[PDB]
Amino acid sequence: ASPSSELRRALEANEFIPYYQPLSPGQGGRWIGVEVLMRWRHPREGLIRPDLFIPFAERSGLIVPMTRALMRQVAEDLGGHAGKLEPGFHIGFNISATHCHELALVDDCRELLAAFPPGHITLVLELTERELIESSEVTDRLFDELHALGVKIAIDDFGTGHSSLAYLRKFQVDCLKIDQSFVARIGIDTLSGHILDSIVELSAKLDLDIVAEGVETPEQRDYLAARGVDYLQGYLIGRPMPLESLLSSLTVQEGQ
Known part of the structure; x- marks a missing residue:
């Protein structure tokens, strides 16, 4: 029984x-x-969330083909429904460290964007600060080519002081994520509020967009709006959903 062969079987079986x-x-x-x-829709186990297998897939060496297949499926799912997406609609992916160490990522992005009318979507890739600190000439070239496509870069797991500012500036990152762990403590923990304020301050300094994760309550939403946070996700907005559910909801929104 080979976990790595099981992942390859799963990928081939869609x-x-x-x-x-x-x-x-x-x-x-x-x-x-x-x-x-x-997600892994496993015929015996049911629906498995990415934190339960992505780390192993990275170790196995399969994360890039899996991410490529995912990007391909998104093009097939949404590229024929551009009328339901208001121009500029963001489509975000979590990109693994190994995918960032290759230039094939540029071609993967170029292909996904070609499935929609030009400029119609904004592709957003989410990386960690480690990918900026542990960078090389490949990184420099990758970020420049992706930016020239109109791809935007979002960063998680970052510092907020002048040392981190230098990396964010060098690579001309576009967005910062607010981790759910800070959002969950809005109104309950003073320090967390200070951390959140520090992230907002860095964003203002570099003119970055902010995505806040784990927004579950109206209190959290209003706190974050009060500080100009651009985008929210979490239970309040909606859980991750299958394509059928997304299309149903988009149809409704196009009607209004």
Whole structure:
């Protein structure tokens, strides 16, 4: 029994499925994008969330082909429904460290964007600060080519002081994520509020967009809107959903 051969079997059998989590403007309104999350629809185990297998797939050496297949499925799922997406609609992916160490990522992005009318979507790739600190000439070239396509880069797991500012500036990152762990402590923990304020301050300094994760309550939403946070995701906005559910909801929003 080979876990790595099982992952390859699964990939060939199209068991890795995109689930779509909506992003909302901080001030409310129609969804402005989705973040794509890879689930494994395992015939015996049921639906498995990515934190339960992505780390192993990275170790196995399979994460890039899996992410490529995911990007391909999203093009097939949404590229024929551009009329349901308001121009500029964001489509976000979590990109693994190994995918960042290659230039094939540029071609993967170029292909996904070609499935929609030019400029119609904004592709957003989410990386960690480690990918900026542990960078090389490949990184420099990758970020420059992706930016020239109109791809935007979002960063998680970052510092907020002048040392981190230098990396964010060098690579001309576009967005910061607010981790759910800070959002969950809005109104309950003073320090967390200070951390959140520090992230907002860095964003203002570098003119970055902010996506806040794990937004579950109206209190959290209003706190974050009060600080100009651009985009929200979490239970309040909606859980990750299968394509059928997304299309149903988009149809409704196009009608209003």
